[PDB]
Each structure stands twice: as structure tokens, then as C-alpha cells.
Write a protein that binds this ligand. Sequence first.
Ligand SMILES: OC[C@H]1O[C@@H](O[C@H]2[C@H](O)[C@@H](O)[C@H](O)O[C@@H]2CO)[C@H](O)[C@@H](O)[C@@H]1O
Ligand SMILES: N[C@@H](Cc1c[nH]c2ccccc12)C(=O)O
Length: 311
Amino acid sequence: GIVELNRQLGRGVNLGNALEAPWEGAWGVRLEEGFFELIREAGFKTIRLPVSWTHHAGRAAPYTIDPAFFSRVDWAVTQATRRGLNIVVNVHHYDELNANPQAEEARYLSIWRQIAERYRNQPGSVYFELLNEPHGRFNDNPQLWNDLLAKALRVVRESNPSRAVIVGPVGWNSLWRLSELRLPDDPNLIVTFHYYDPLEFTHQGAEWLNPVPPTGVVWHQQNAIAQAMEFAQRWAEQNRRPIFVGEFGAYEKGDLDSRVRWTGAVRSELEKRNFSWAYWEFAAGFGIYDRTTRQWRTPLLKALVPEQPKL
Ligand SMILES: OC[C@H]1O[C@@H](O[C@H]2[C@H](O)[C@@H](O)[C@H](O)O[C@@H]2CO)[C@H](O)[C@@H](O)[C@@H]1O
Ligand SMILES: N[C@@H](Cc1c[nH]c2ccccc12)C(=O)O
């Protein structure tokens, strides 16, 4: 059942700054086969694979996805799966859809039909995630996302009747917007949110924000994490949905000891609430692995995968 498929997600990591950029490598991370073994050996069971299909699909119907790009996603799915890892395949950045859901609907639903048909025979360790962090017009009217996600789920279910499908709320997958999320009567949904509070800390110096939060911000634990995760757990219980927190992490412009405090505090509370999770992210500016030295960032890795349960 879906609660067990969510538990199987367990501990995971995002392969970020990769296929969700305009093209693979544009944001600094080209995928390598060796990543899968590294990630498995470090104690993770799941890869989250951000994919920004919009750059690679035709603009005119039938909105065909470039075959070479599709083959690269095939490779990532196969290499993770054969090596024992779960993989979450999503639609990630999609500026056009967040800006104009109605105008971009046909293209988005064609993209999902292509993905769903292509991967319909993959095992249950392959999960679909309908849309990363809805925002834009979905923030203005969260019901636009409720309507659209039901359409995309319907498309997926025409070829994948029971695959786990991961769905989050608006506000960039903000748990506070779970209140406005409405989901179909489908027994194989996993609900997701992302956790980056306080943005002033986790995203200090992140240039892709406007405004850019200043750096020099330290962090220690108070009660915000516990309050947030309990709110989300009660929503999940009230609606009988399992939870996967598909991104959390703190950017390298923050001081390391604060980042470690924050990362461990969040991981500990996620697991206390029986949330599966995926850390943002493997190898870039939030990374736990430094490709230049081929070394793990041990303080952060051990905050994710502690050697004793209360550490
Ligand atoms: O550039 C706008 C776009 O950036 C995304 O963040 C990237 C960033 O572009 C990249 O330079 C940096 O190294 O990593 C971050 C995180 O992947 C951001 O996620 C988008 O929301 C934004 O539209
Ligand atoms: N196929 C190309 C060029 C193209 C063909 N028809 C279009 C209509 C609108 C915009 C672009 C196009 C693309 O999708 O970019």
C-alpha cells in the first residue's frame, strides 16, 4: 500500500543543479553513473530527480519531448533502479505553467502523458511527482492547482493505474497551504512539502531570489520546526495521506555549524513525524559531496545519517 511505498522512500537526496536547469550542466552538475553508488553507500535509499521538461519539449502540439533528452532521463531512471535506489521523477521548473496555468495546460498534460506512457512498466521504486513548488497564478488561486493536478493525475492513471504519485500544495510547496490543497479520491497519493524556514538563513546570499537575503545569519533551534512538522502531521492524519518532504537544506553561504544544527534539527523532526524526505542537494551549493576533492562534507552528512539515533 501507499503508506509502505512512502516509508520505502525513507532517506533520500536530490540530484540538483542538473536536469532542472535549462540543460544538463548549465547550473554546474552533470550527472555521472558513479553518483548512484556513492549515494547508496552513504545510507540513502532514494534519488529525487528534478527535471525541467519545458526546455526540451516542442512549443506546438503535440509538444514532443526531445528524444536525446528523454534518453538521458531513461538512463537516470534505469541506473538508479538497477542499483537498488528509488527514484522520484518530477516536473520541476516550469515558469510558463506557473505564470499562465490555463494557457500552458495542454503542453503540461502532453508532457505528463509522454512521461507516464514511457515509464508505465517501471517497478514501484519509480515514483511520479506532478509539479515542483506551484507558485505564480497558483498562489493567487490555489484552486487552479487543485483543478490542474486532478487533470494531470487522470492522464497518469490512464497508463499507470497504481503508481505512487507525489502531490504538494501551492506557496512553493508550503505546508501552510496544505489547508487549501484538495485531492481526488485516489489511494496511491503521497503528499509532499518543502522546508526551508527561515529563508533568511537557508537562502542567505542566494542570488536567484529577489530580494537577495543578506549573509552573516546564524541559526539555532527554538520551536518553529516542531510547530511546523506537527501542523503538517495533523493535516496528514486528518486527510489519511503519507508525507514525503522532498526538499530541505541550507545554502553554503551560511556558516557551517549553523547549517549542521539546522539540517540535523530538521531531519530529526521529520523522522519523529514519520515523514520520508529528500535533502537539497547532492553536490552543488547545498551539497553534501564535493566533486572537486571527491570528499563528503562529513558534518552535514552525519547530520543526515547519524551514527547513533540521538545524534
Ligand atoms: O536563476 C533563476 C532560477 O535559479 C534556480 O536556482 C539555482 C541557480 O540558478 C543556480 O545559479 C544555483 O547555483 O543553484 C540554484 C538552485 O538550483 C532557482 O531554483 C529557480 O527558482 C530560479 O528561477
Ligand atoms: N519546435 C521548435 C520551433 C517551433 C515550431 N513551432 C513553433 C511554434 C511556436 C514556438 C516555437 C515553435 C520549438 O518548439 O521551439
